[PDB]
Design a binder for this molecule. Structure first.
Ligand SMILES: [Mg+2]
Ligand SMILES: [Mg+2]
Ligand SMILES: [Mg+2]
Ligand SMILES: [Mg+2]
Lengths: 244, 244
DNA sequence: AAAGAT
DNA sequence: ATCTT
DNA sequence: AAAGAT
DNA sequence: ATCTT
């Protein structure tokens, strides 16, 4: 399927190529930095060609946002099935040691999930799936990156800003957690687990409907939350209480 | 001076080189996207080797943040004068057609400018200068060609996501405006003007001291600013009356 | 964690 | 990291 | 703009 | 665009 093909392609590409610099048309190569600010942008660009290749193979049109602060990164759909759109968003985070727990910021909880057309390319109801392609890289020990340039012949001497990288594709609701991922930018936090759990999809919500209801009613500050719910347990007790 | 040299080097590099993609160690090239999220990352990486080259020529050490949420992008200082550090921050914005008015988000106004050691590599008082290297690019409509990968022998064929790029170096206080550049992330907004005004330094503050005082007392919401000051005129009248 | 930095 | 209405 | 999206 | 305490 589109999903199984996309997952195989992502694994393959990631295993075969290592990004090491930005290149100018003149052949000069500028090395990379090791922070997520840099790598989140790189991994997103690294994914575009793959997604588009697999999408075309399945008769899907791929669309990117026109307004820069709109979701999702890629919208896929067959022209004949306009209301069966698939959303794909890329997220990046890091680890210091390969066997540690990770968590992602998965997007806002006050935009399109609460307002059907807010900051989204197409109305939320036209999407039947929301996939997250997550990249986890291991940071390099040296806090001092290369500060010079290279030429095409020196590709093998360019230090890579990461020790390793892992990728997975999973439905957003499945990896969503119950604690906000950011404060002032009101983001949904993912589960705080090991890589394996994201791949296998061992989440905390019972269904996508529960995931949505929980985040559509989550309050912004702990002050407001203490009278409603601060986690999944309290949310379920809040349902029992009659949503008051 | 270090300043005149840095400006010349940036200006020169920018005209002679055009970044067109990210390269993998195996020689595969991935095209760039056309939004600021991508270009701001590329321009920073582009600037790094140039800054380090000119700094070394003048006997300056160049240091980058150890932690991701620290300002500035680059700290420069001579080993013999540690209390005369120079901060350089790279800022990017876009334009739809050449010669339109532009504005930048210049960083927070509630961190290191209000607390000497908050989110900054070195205590704020050890810096004698705060420079902004700003990039302005004219956005270009993405095509189908920018959605496939390329090889080294095809460098000239890869379509560029920008029409033209202009760069400038100026003091932060000189280009700082009197209205916030962002709400929830509390950022200082720059003056809203044409590129030449940034180069020439036609701002609104009379001194760096006025810029600092203005932003150290600026309130986060218009409701809190209604009784204080919302712009430079009101701020001056407020000062005149005794800050009450 | 929550809140507020980049 | 900065954009949009 | 100011406020709230990414 | 995510991170840090
Ligand atoms: Mg965006
Ligand atoms: Mg994205
Ligand atoms: Mg940073
Ligand atoms: Mg920067």
């Amino acid at each position: 399927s589109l999903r199984s093909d996309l997952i195989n392609a992502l694994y393959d590409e990631n295993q075969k190529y290592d990004v090491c610099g930005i290149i100018s048309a003149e052949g000069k190569i500028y090395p990379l930095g090791s922070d997520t600010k840099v790598l989140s942008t790189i991994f997103e660009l690294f994914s575009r060609p793959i997604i588009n290749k697999i999408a075309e193979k399945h008769g899907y049109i791929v669309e990117e946002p026109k307004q820069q602060n709109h979701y999702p990164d890629f919208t896929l759909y067959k022209p004949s099935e306009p209301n069966k759109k698939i959303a794909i968003d890329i997220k990046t985070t890091y680890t210091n040691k390969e066997n540690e727990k990770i968590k992602f910021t998965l997007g806002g909880y006050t935009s399109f999930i609460r307002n059907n057309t807010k900051n989204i390319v197409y109305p939320f109801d036209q999407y039947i799936a929301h996939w997250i392609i997550g990249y986890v890289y291991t940071r390099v020990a040296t806090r001092k990156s290369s500060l010079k340039t290279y030429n095409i012949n020196e590709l093998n001497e360019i230090p890579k800003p990461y020790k390793g990288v892992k990728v997975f594709l999973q439905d957003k609701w499945v990896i969503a957690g119950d604690l906000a991922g950011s404060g002032n930018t009101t983001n949904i936090g993912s589960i705080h687990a090991h890589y394996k759990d994201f791949v296998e999809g061992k989440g905390i919500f019972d269904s996508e409907d529960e995931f949505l209801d929980y985040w559509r009613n989550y309050e912004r500050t702990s002050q407001l939350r203490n009278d409603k719910y601060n986690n999944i347990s309290e949310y379920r007790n809040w349902i029992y209480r009659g949503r008051k």
